[PDB]
Amino acid sequence: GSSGSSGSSSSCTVTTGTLGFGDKFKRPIGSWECSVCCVSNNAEDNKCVSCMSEKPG
């Protein structure tokens, strides 16, 4: 137990140490899985449809 804040607030993120891709994400070869919304997109489509974000790469 540690004190020093307003109201007990449990966190999930690792303090004093941030990581990336904590888990795996099933994505197709051709198409590309968005990151902001993580919605299916069209390889040819240089943008998203759910968030309309520019395709990475």
Would you tell me which residues interact with Zn ion (CB under 5 A)?
34, 37, 39, 48, 50-51, 53
In the complex with Zn ion, the residue whose CB is nearer, 28 or 51, is 51
- Residue 6 tokens read as 């307003």
Distances in Å between the alpha carbon of 56 and those of 11, 21, 23, 33, 39? 30, 16, 20, 10, 13
Residue 53: CB minimum distance to Zn ion, A: 5
**In the complex, least distance from residue 39 CB atom to Zn ion, rounded to whole angstroms:** 5
Nearer to Zn ion, 12 or 54 (CB): 54
Q: Is 38 annotated as a binding residue?
A: no
